[PDB]
Symmetry: C3
Subunit: 238 residues, 3 copies
């Protein structure tokens, strides 16, 4: 996160840090608790990931320093990538992790509500992007979970800023005209959380942008409300 | 209907009573006129129904006592159950009855409008559940069509009350925190009708709940607006 | 267009005139620029059209007199008709033209934004229908692009006026109770453009009506917002 500040412990209790153990253990991406066995994250996070066996999901974390060999985590039973996903910049950048065990909810770890199709008309005015990603394009993973308040930008405006792309209605953009606050490398898959009528909603999934926090380059997020049918379908037992 | 009152004749002119003739004739479920040849109702009503030949749809009824051997009814040509339906508590609790003959509309029998996808944002504040069902969990079918005004509850709130279920965006809930007013056995398949801008809309189909009218147990209804595409598809000739 | 007036040059810069060259060259239908290589229009326009080779799309036109043998145009590479289209009156009256070359945008030719699913709740109050069609049921193609401001009508109201049809949620209607302003023959496939929050949105595609501008006979338009998923799907490369 560029231009953000340190979070208060547990103020984003749906935020997880997804680690890979290969070759050695490191933070890979953000994600969001949306169900007792379910993390919603970005498909692009799994480039070159051939097995869920190398993944570990840590909940209730503020500082990466909390994570040691003796720290408890959730194993991943299954990675579900949207069947139309090819790459972040073409959309469908959404994935589910089915956990091996269930999350016991508490003040530090609880699920975020999905957006309602009826809130499509809502103007979200209190939106935050969070993560342990870079503070600049070439940097490193940050210890303390960072937050930045960023305004949503219309898809018409977003399209103006990305003339070489198609910004679709399945994407949502957020950024300041002058830049300065944005997601960056390592924030991928985490939430764009918007508080509306005293309820936090998972409006976006951190996906891509050209650089980080540049002027006239809004961050591009997966528009979660366009995938609530897909999420429902994929989270049913069979 | 628990905690309701007797309806005025024809104040719910889309409400039908669906009877089965097997083994002897009795009220089975409620339903709603949505087209000249079409009743919308709940899939769960047809458990163990092997043929539409045993079904009779009566329109323009206030009192069950109106129904005798010499009372006119509509035959059922086809029962269309949602292909994803398994049971009420897992959703997709929706079915269409294609009638053998067409309903001639009149003051006592006319169709209710389907909800618009653009009204998803609307806060419906004038919603009523109607039927000839039980006034308590163990009771019997009531003679006079009952009505009860019940407030909609958010899906977030509804999910809190049904921790052992998944309350999906294809469901909608209604109830008082303190209970006392609700649908019950025999009200299944009938409408949750909401009046907005002087027009009645078929917002829900009476589906299920834990008991009837209990504290902290909202009634769960099929969220009709999520099925307008399905209804359109299934009501086309071929 | 019945009851309309002459447009100002380029005030509808997304409006194209689609010509057929067979047997000799003539205006066939309207259409709208929605992308650099993409025109959105009505499926019914292509009755008896067996090849895209006979089609020419002219942008930046006010007067048909501008079009001569030496006037530049866009060739059509592909006609994409909705796979459920059968005829205008049954809906799915939507088609895409993929152009052979790309449109270079300018003040006289630029794309119109598609409606957002979140604007379904919006009451559009500034809507215009445009084209070179007839000024009365039996007439001829008009030289100067005509415009008429027409109010949207609810689908409930529209259905009342077309008792022999099914007016679906994939249609949108516009007209005056007393008639007098409407699309007519030759306006097919053009836009119903509505300006909301200083942005023009392509709300409808001119489709059909009983006669032109008759009392109690609103024009029926393809409800574009119901097809944004389809448009996205069909405009992707493969
Ligand atoms: C993931 C990522 C990497 C990057 O370099 N820039 C970005 C800018 C914006 C958003 Cl939303 C994400 C990214
Ligand atoms: C159908 C039914 C049976 C029952 O026992 N309880 C209910 C409670 C609420 C609603 Cl909406 C329906 C029912
Ligand atoms: C295309 C067309 C032909 C016609 O004769 N009447 C109409 C009336 C209304 C609308 Cl929207 C279109 C038409």
């Amino acid at each position: 996160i560029v231009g953000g500040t340190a979070s208060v412990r547990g103020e984003w209790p749906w935020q997880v840090t997804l680690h890979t153990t290969s070759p050695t253990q490191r933070h890979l991406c953000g994600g969001s608790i949306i169900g007792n066995q379910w993390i919603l994250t970005a498909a692009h996070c799994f480039y070159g990931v051939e097995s869920p066996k190398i993944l570990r999901v840590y909940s209730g974390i503020l500082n990466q320093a909390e994570i040691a060999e003796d720290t408890s985590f959730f194993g991943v039973q299954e990675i579900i990538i949207h069947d139309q996903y090819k790459m972040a910049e073409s959309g469908y950048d959404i994935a589910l992790l089915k956990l091996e065990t269930t999350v016991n909810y508490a003040d530090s770890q609880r699920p975020i509500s999905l957006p309602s199709k009826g809130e499509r008309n809502v103007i979200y005015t209190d939106c935050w992007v969070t993560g342990w990603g870079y503070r600049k394009l070439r940097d490193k993973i940050q210890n303390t979970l960072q937050k930045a308040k960023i305004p949503l930008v219309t898809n018409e405006e977003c399209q103006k800023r990305y003339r070489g792309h198609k910004i679709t209605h399945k994407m949502i953009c957020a950024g300041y005209r002058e830049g300065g606050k944005d997601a960056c490398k390592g924030d991928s898959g985490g939430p764009l959380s918007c508080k509306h009528n005293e309820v936090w909603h998972l409006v976006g999934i951190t996906s891509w942008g050209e650089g980080c926090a540049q002027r006239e380059r809004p961050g591009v997020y997966t528009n979660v409300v366009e995938y609530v049918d897909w999420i429902l379908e994929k989270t049913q037992a069979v």
